[PDB]
Ligand binder design. Structure first.
Ligand SMILES: CCn1c2c(c(=O)[nH]c1=O)[C@H]1C(=C(C)N2)C(=O)OCc2ccccc2OCCOc2cc(C)ccc21
Length: 126
């Protein structure tokens, strides 16, 4: 029923790079999704207490959210663009695993995912 610690957004032992692709992921991709009308469920770690979801963190064992991603990008946490893309994909997949296919939140995630995949199709070359 309680929340786990959130995913780390810094770690002095983890290697990292600043690449043009990661800058794009922050300045274009994250910013575009963050401002979307459907972003709000995804802007912070899932609070299973507030949401009365005592099974959330029994079903979702790799939690991810755009607040964490935003901090990771701002903090230069990632080694490459693929690490960040994987975090977005985990976030969307978690929503589809936890929720039923007809749910409103699934429609919202699907709209954000469509936009996300459009923006990463324009991902600049390394
Ligand atoms: C991403 C994590 N997430 C998630 C929800 C969810 O259902 N599934 C998830 O995976 C919830 C939810 C959030 C922040 N996040 C929220 O704010 O819920 C308030 C709430 C509190 C107590 C009781 C019911 C209740 O709302 C029932 C409808 O829930 C909806 C419906 C829509 C359109 C969007 C989100 C949600």
């Amino acid at each position: 029923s309680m929340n786990p610690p959130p995913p780390e957004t810094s770690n002095p032992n983890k290697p990292k790079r600043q690449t043009n692709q990661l800058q794009y992921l922050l300045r274009v991709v994250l910013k575009t999704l963050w401002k979307h009308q459907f972003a709000w469920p995804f802007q912070q770690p899932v609070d299973a207490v507030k949401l009365n979801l005592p099974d959330y963190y029994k079903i979702i064992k790799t939690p991810m959210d755009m607040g964490t991603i935003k901090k990771r990008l701002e903090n230069n946490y990632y080694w490459n663009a693929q690490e960040c893309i994987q975090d977005f994909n985990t976030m969307f997949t978690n929503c589809y695993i936890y929720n039923k296919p007809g749910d409103d939140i699934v429609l919202m995630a699907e709209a954000l995912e469509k936009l996300f995949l459009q923006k990463i199709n324009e991902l600049p070359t390394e």
